[PDB]
């Protein structure tokens, strides 16, 4: 049966997928493309004209940022057994976009434009880097409370990026155990093989070989602090999920 | 039943798709996104998580640069009735990549790198802009002589970009008639609505509104002329198709 690592952009997809690959391998992940080989990102596969079997006989582990209800996922409607929904603080996601885009905390003008768009969209809708991901609460709802709407046979386990970072081997095991990949023995090594350090080192090594690759809001202006806080404590599905996963 | 405008990159996809949209509309195409709306490019749809119905009841016209055998197209195996295979001189395709990449005919160093890669790949395999398109003869074979391998019920009509450019209303009609979209009356207007001139004007107008958008080898070095001519007159499937569609 079919499994998904679902995650809204910048939630820590690459890291969790890398850990799950080294765990399954029992070996560190030598090159970046090892992530796409270990837990294929569906968007990646589609770009090449791949499209994994609907109704596989053995367990297949895939990843995506799509909401569960995108038409392309319908082929997996009945075969989807499990979902791991990786979630991260929306504040940090928004800062993460600023970093990956090379914007320093001194181009306030340009940062304000990102945070205002993110606040109005309740996510990344206007960022062209990604498609079909919806807003942040739309994404989570679709993979959690309304998952049966898209995948009637699915069980779901949420995991917060912040709990993964605080206790990597404990939370990884929850995931490994839920996905039924094996014993807790190999979990320690998987964590050690994929630290922030080992990750950057491996990404740089790959970029150089030619291979394919890739805080607070106060510094911004108090009126973006209030605009965020309004959204964070308001009555939308955004606020719902922020409270539910302890981000208020 | 399902139809395809298949075409290797730079073959004139946008232009033929634009003409087919204005023909079907009976009106000019006001904005660039009108092309994707009129004859959706499958890669485009997949990027958003769309995936058109397998086995539609009425005629659906889609476009792609994928070879016919990409796994993602299997969903349309049985429902595919027709293919229009748009083909262009491989020499011009290679020059076209140079233009769209903003390389002047005076950065010979950089041009040589493109032509040498294109010659060795027999197409665009190494250009990251596109994926799943295969080499030039692989692409054509898959949509023509071996089409039944991927789409057992399909009839195919080839059209050369060069014949479209020499006689636009005559060759467009061949396409319109083969796809059974209606009478020859509207063909004249479709051609006039989508000239190189009207096209650039519409693309610039769109870019400005904010909307989403996008000779010879002698000048290069005689040893690339000979490298191309060797390939063009050699014994590979490349040479086969170059002779067959009058590019030798």
Swiss-Prot record, chains A, B:
Catalytic center residues: 65
SUPFAM superfamilies in the record: P-loop containing nucleoside triphosphate hydrolases
Enzyme class: transferase
GO biological process, alphabetically ordered: antibiotic biosynthetic process
Annotated consequence of substituting residue 99 to A: Almost no change in activity
Source taxon at top rank: Bacteria
Annotated phenotype, changing residue 32 to F: Almost loss of activity
Binding site for 3'-phosphoadenylyl sulfate: 10-15, 88, 96-99, 161, 194-196
Pathway annotation: Antibiotic biosynthesis
Protein name from the UniProt record: Desulfo-A47934 sulfotransferase
